[PDB]
Design a protein around this ligand. Sequence first.
Ligand SMILES: [Fe+3]
Ligand SMILES: [Fe+3]
Ligand SMILES: [Fe+3]
Ligand SMILES: [Fe+3]
Ligand SMILES: [Fe+3]
Ligand SMILES: [Fe+3]
Lengths: 190, 190
Amino acid sequence: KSLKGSRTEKNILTAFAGESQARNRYNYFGGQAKKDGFVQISDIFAETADQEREHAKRLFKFLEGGDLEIVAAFPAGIIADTHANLIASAAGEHHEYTEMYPSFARIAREEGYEEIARVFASIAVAEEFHEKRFLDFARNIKEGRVFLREQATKWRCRNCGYVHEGTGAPELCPACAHPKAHFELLGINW
Amino acid sequence: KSLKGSRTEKNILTAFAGESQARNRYNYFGGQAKKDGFVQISDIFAETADQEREHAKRLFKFLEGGDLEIVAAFPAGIIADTHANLIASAAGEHHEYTEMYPSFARIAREEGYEEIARVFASIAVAEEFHEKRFLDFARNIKEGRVFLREQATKWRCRNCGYVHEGTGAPELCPACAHPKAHFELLGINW
Ligand SMILES: [Fe+3]
Ligand SMILES: [Fe+3]
Ligand SMILES: [Fe+3]
Ligand SMILES: [Fe+3]
Ligand SMILES: [Fe+3]
Ligand SMILES: [Fe+3]
């Protein structure tokens, strides 16, 4: 039915607003990650920013009216060092899939908007992987395993694609001469 | 002084939230412009989205705390045809420089935050050009002068840079074979 004048309508705008701020936060965090020497982590933040843009677009496409008042609490800033930024992000992601989305999906059902409850529940699934990914990176940093493993693996320079075998990523890539910050664990997903 | 517990603090988060949603709206509007056959207009929306990201970043950098509750009305959606999207954008831009920013700048002063009042007043200046730019494009569309003038001018294909002299942009660019949608009025600003 019509969305105008329902708790769900107000809920979609709230989700859109939080997702909108998250996209900006993740992009700023990506910038700081790059300046901290974590290029792979920098690009993940950027990718996540992009994915929130898409969660925001699906929700926005449901909206049909003019002005709508919202009451909501959002994190009042802070761009810190990368490890802290990763911890703050996971926490935000955590609240979305554990509290915000489940609740909004539940309400949309009570109100006869199953398709929107379907979308709200599906976004939460993606929000769970974002948190996990942020948590793993935070841990690697804290344990110092970002650029060095205990056993010998293959490392890839994201800048030129040079593959390196060893316990750790080299100081400078021998092909493109870009620094260690550009190396990641070689991955294959096909 | 400290920003915590001031009307200004709440005002910065509000500006950050609205700017955050504007960046997403302008990007969605850019997509629709591209699908409407207005590539120059599409890129302007994209550029504007990027500039709001930067207004949002300056404001965000002032924030120092945790969670903060906000009460505010935001436009509850709508991606329509390009002319309407341009009209809605100018209106939003209009409210920012005429009402929101002046007011927030005024309050920041009463509260001893001159530097923030300085930033708030400077953003409004940029918000005034965004509106004007959106208004001109809306008018050209409505009057049908997007791809055709009364006197003969020079038109440039944004895709390959081919310069065309005439009253109107050609159906297909002769160099890159991309359609009329890619042409703009040749401009020089140096
Ligand atoms: Fe999210
Ligand atoms: Fe997320
Ligand atoms: Fe390399
Ligand atoms: Fe703005
Ligand atoms: Fe603007
Ligand atoms: Fe061309």
